[PDB]
């Protein structure tokens, strides 16, 4: 068991079951260890060895085994289920221990909604200053996943420009945002720059232009 | 019964070394082993290295042989993780653990590592900025029945925290504080922005970046 695989992300609904698998060399001898972790707290162990919960933890979670792949089953997939799950096992020529590239479980709590964007040109007072930002807000889409790409004249544009991963507390709706820094010249060079938010399969897209 | 107490965030310089502790209240060490492993801003767990504190001899992953060191103190009962030589890829959250190895051997005799216990978790942050004060600048309206958009860009602040109120607190109408964006200058960078009705009201934003002891009011003039 020198590396452990698994999906990078999984989708569910409320109350579907969902079923994060983990695939390694050496899952035949060792049993798969699972982890739940939320953003900006450590890992807590959901899962070991074989009906082996921990306490606390509620009874949706169950392991199962077939051979060199582990697979963690949640029954209820509950809105607080969403997280990233980690399968962890023991390497057995070296003590080294291996960790799966982690599922990220998103449970489909609430309905889609469109992303609402809205691109703010270099401010004039910040070009006193000899630079520009273009600031484009994302704001109330859901799923939480959206892709920011940015454009000048018919050109993607690919260097400075810095996306913020989206995250939103007022409600389930999910925000964002991205910078695109450059300087006067460059803004004042091109007739228009473009930021093009896709979602889902839809992407919206608002130009701005020196005037 | 058990935890385990890791030491407070650190921002360290890229050439400098930190040196992450982990204390054990109630259990002792015993045979049980404290494991360090880390988490990358948005990448996955990385496992660093492992110690068996009463034997007292550690083994390292493939790439951290030569940089981490794993130490393990039984008169603190405190374990320690050493790395050297600090750089922006090693900004992350370094976790202590306490890994189990176990056996079942009905059947064929099948292994098991899980950790129960872990540390609340290290954050390391490398950069090579100082502490700077913020520069605040004004996003504009421009010309759905009014909702007008209209916010401040906080640009080139390296201390974390940061906060925004529109008119002193005072303004609440749809006034969203996205997280800071960390550009290549190692230097965050926020937006605040609120919609109102196109019509007169005075829209003045503060913001207070309290590490540089800095407080800038602005006021966001229409075009």
């Known amino acids: 068991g020198s590396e452990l695989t698994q999906d990078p992300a999984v989708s569910v609904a409320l109350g579907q079951t969902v079923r994060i698998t983990c695939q390694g060399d050496?899952?035949?001898?060792?049993?798969a260890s699972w982890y739940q972790q939320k953003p900006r707290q450590a890992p807590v162990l959901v899962f070991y060895?074989?009906?082996n919960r921990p306490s606390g933890i509620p009874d949706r979670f169950s392991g199962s085994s077939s051979g060199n792949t582990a697979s963690l089953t949640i029954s209820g997939a509950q809105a607080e289920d969403e997280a990233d799950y980690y399968c962890?096992?023991?390497?057995?020529?070296?003590?080294?221990?291996?960790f799966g590239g982690g599922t990220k479980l998103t449970v489909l709590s609430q309905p889609k909604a469109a992303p609402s964007v809205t691109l703010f040109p270099p401010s004039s007072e910040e070009l006193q200053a000899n630079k520009a930002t273009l600031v484009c807000l994302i704001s109330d889409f859901y799923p939480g996943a959206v892709t920011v790409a940015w454009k000048a004249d018919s050109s993607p544009v690919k260097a400075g420009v810095e996306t913020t991963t989206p995250s939103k507390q007022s409600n389930n709706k999910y925000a964002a945002s991205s910078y695109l820094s450059l300087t006067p010249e460059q803004w004042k060079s091109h007739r228009s720059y473009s930021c093009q938010v896709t979602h889902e399969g839809s992407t919206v897209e608002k130009t701005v232009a020196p005037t | 019964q058990v935890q385990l107490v890791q030491s407070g965030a650190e921002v360290k310089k890229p050439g400098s070394s930190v040196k992450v502790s982990c204390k054990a209240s109630?259990?002792?060490?015993?045979?049980?082993?404290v494991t360090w492993v880390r988490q990358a801003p948005g990448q996955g767990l990385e496992w660093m290295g492992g110690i068996i504190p009463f034997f007292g001899e550690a083994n390292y992953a493939q790439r951290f042989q030569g940089r981490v060191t794993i130490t393990a103190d039984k008169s603190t009962n405190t374990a320690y993780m050493e790395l050297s030589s600090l750089r922006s890829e090693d900004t992350a959250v370094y976790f202590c653990a306490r890994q189990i190895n176990e056996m079942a051997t009905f059947g064929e005799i099948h292994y098991y590592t899980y950790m129960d216990v872990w540390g609340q978790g290290t954050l390391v942050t490398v950069s090579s900025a100082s502490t700077k004060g913020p520069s605040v600048f004004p996003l504009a309206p421009s010309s759905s029945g009014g909702t007008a958009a209209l916010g401040c860009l906080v640009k080139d602040y390296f201390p974390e925290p940061v906060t925004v109120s529109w008119n002193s607190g005072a303004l609440t109408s749809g006034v969203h504080t996205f997280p800071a964006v960390l550009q290549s200058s190692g230097l965050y960078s926020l937006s605040s922005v609120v919609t109102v009705p196109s019509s007169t009201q005075t829209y003045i934003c503060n913001v207070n970046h309290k590490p540089s002891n800095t407080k800038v009011d602005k006021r966001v003039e229409p075009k």
């Open positions: 050496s899952l035949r001898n060792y049993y």
């Open positions: 962890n096992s023991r390497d057995s020529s070296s003590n080294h221990l291996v």
């Open positions: 109630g259990a002792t060490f015993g045979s049980d082993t």
């Open positions: 060895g074989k009906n």
